[PDB]
Design a binder for this molecule. Sequence first.
Ligand SMILES: O=c1ccn([C@@H]2O[C@H](COP(=O)(O)OP(=O)(O)O)[C@@H](O)[C@H]2O)c(=O)[nH]1
Ligand SMILES: COc1c(O)cc2occ(-c3ccc(O)cc3)c(=O)c2c1O
Length: 429
Amino acid sequence: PTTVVLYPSPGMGHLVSMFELAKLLDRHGLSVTVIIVEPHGSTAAFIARSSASNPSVSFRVLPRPEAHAFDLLRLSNPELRRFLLESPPSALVLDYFCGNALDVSAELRIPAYYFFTSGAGVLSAFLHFPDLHSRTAASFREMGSSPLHFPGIPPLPADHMPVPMLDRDDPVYESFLYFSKRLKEAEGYIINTFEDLEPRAVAAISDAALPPNYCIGPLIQSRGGSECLAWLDAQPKRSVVFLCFGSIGLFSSEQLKEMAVGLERSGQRFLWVVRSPPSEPDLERILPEGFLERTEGRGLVVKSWAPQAAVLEHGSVGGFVTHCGWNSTLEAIASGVPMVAWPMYAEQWMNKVFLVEEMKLAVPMEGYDKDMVTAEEVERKVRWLMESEGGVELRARTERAKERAAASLAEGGKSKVALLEVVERMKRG
Ligand SMILES: O=c1ccn([C@@H]2O[C@H](COP(=O)(O)OP(=O)(O)O)[C@@H](O)[C@H]2O)c(=O)[nH]1
Ligand SMILES: COc1c(O)cc2occ(-c3ccc(O)cc3)c(=O)c2c1O
């Protein structure tokens, strides 16, 4: 039995997305072990569920010895060599942030693949970052809107680079230059995208002076959770706008007011997921007075969390006001739900440019790059999604992407092929 070790970087979101790969590989008959490095939700709870529902995927918690996780990982290089010495695996699957482990798989002569959870557009940029880094002395926050030109992808305003990379004189930045440099050294690239979604992007990185790549997705990670599904069932087909903004709420209460006044003034049915403004949520302390009373029946506000994958599959959902996280983008495309981009943190501002300019499966929410998105602008874009001809045209474009996706995944498809290509490649020494 061929054995792989998948090394995600610390964090539940990284773990949950490696596990998806792990099930996939063990679904193609590999003995896979997720290696875990614990931070300082719940890791035990996840090992227990994964172990009870997918017993063939086993875990290996290492003796614990953006920023802290880079230190946690450099220092776990000893302990990771111990586990791989006691049984050499056929292949090692790494996160972008786990490049310190490339040192371990050097000596031990073990083929390393990166599992890249963002699309090939984000990879291109991350792969060509160090080159641009040396062609300029200016950091990206200084460069402002000045173009960064990366192979295969639209010019990207420099200030849409991920925050960690915006200031050169910041130890986090140096690590990203380290992890991006180390991407060249790999045997391969497993990307959670499909070629038809990002064709021009795949092509530029499918270069010879660059390790191969295997686009094997969408890999989607598939009580007040049941309630919003019930209320959804209560709505006419395709009539609800879903606003959901990832794992970290970054809306002030006054920004939440604009959203509510804008949603109220659009007339549209809305399913809106709201977290506590930064330093659980008090909706009537936070939202405009009378809002819940006025809009109940027409919309539902959900504290902190909703079953998003379920929600997006529902036939009552006709539009998605998203923060352009990659998993949420995949989940939206695979249900053919058209999108309004409101990127917020991490690499989402990137995703947004590609989502609006390259892929053309969303429209921006003007003001994401500003202090606040206005009630006016929220209302216009929700009107535009549910009512306008552009919206019907856009919902058409997504429908296509839904099918290019469904096709890429079913037998013979471009991603399915890539999957077996990388699995077979793993079985050979
Ligand atoms: O209320 C919520 C918010 C998010 N998600 C899920 O959390 C993941 C978010 O991952 P993504 O990469 O899109 O964004 P991030 O949270 O990393 O910014 C996706 O699977 C969403 O479907 C969810 O189920 N419920
Ligand atoms: C929820 O799951 C994942 C995941 O599995 C992997 C991920 O890898 C990278 C990013 C990212 C974020 C900020 C940045 O500056 C550079 C890269 C990321 O957000 C991310 C993620 O959200």
